[PDB]
């Protein structure tokens with residue numbers, strides 16, 4: 001009865017694996033419109049149109065830092081675009097604009113007959129992710145475009161931590177030992193500012209500022225939570241309500257918080 005549900009019934013093991021159920025292909029965007037470069041990852045056999053996610057790196061950084069999210073998320077039934085910004089030194093507001101330009105072009109390619117993603121995207125269902133200033137930009141995107149279905153930035157930073165207006169379901173990945181954007185000055189005040197949304201705070205035990213980037217040692221836990229969050233809120237898929245909203249009870253997590261995360265038959269502890 002859910003028109004957006006895709007793929008098999010999830011398990012902890014199926015979500016911790018590096019590869020989800022769907023075959024993934026990818027291509028380079030030949031003329032980026034409003035951003036520097038992009039790679040689009042897509043499932044060939046998702047069983048219907050899927051939502052789209054745009055992911056942005058941090059200051060000085062490039063697609064390599066965020067690339068692993070492409071195959072991880074696309075294999076569970078999403079079209080994912082990872083971008084390079086017009087300049088590696090762009091600030092969060094510009095990163096937000098370029099993130100939204102990448103989503104716009106994914107929608108354009110969905111209607112372009114020659115494109116590998118022709119007709120593969122539900123353009124009414126989109127999400128935003130990104131690292132550090134690109135995570136700040138993701139929250140700016142969410143604040144300015146409340147029809148976005150989900151946000152999941154990692155080690156986010158912005159010159160202001162006040163995202164009180166955000167109504168988009170937002171998962172904040174935090175890195176416990178972040179010295180660039182320390183948790184108590186960045187990720188946690190950002191999380192605490194949001195009182196109008198479903199939200200979650202997931203702090204990775206012992207993580208440096210790059211703890212959610214390509215090659216990290218927690219792709220099982222981080223990927224499981226990212227996929228479950230995007231599935232629950234971009235697809236309204238309540239098969240993922242538990243994976244999305246529950247404390248994962250992992251030795252790799254040093255701090256877990258969540259609010260307005262709908263769970264039937266939840267305990268009271």
Ligand SMILES: [Cl-]
Nearest residue numbers: 058059132133
């Ligand atoms: Cl940054």
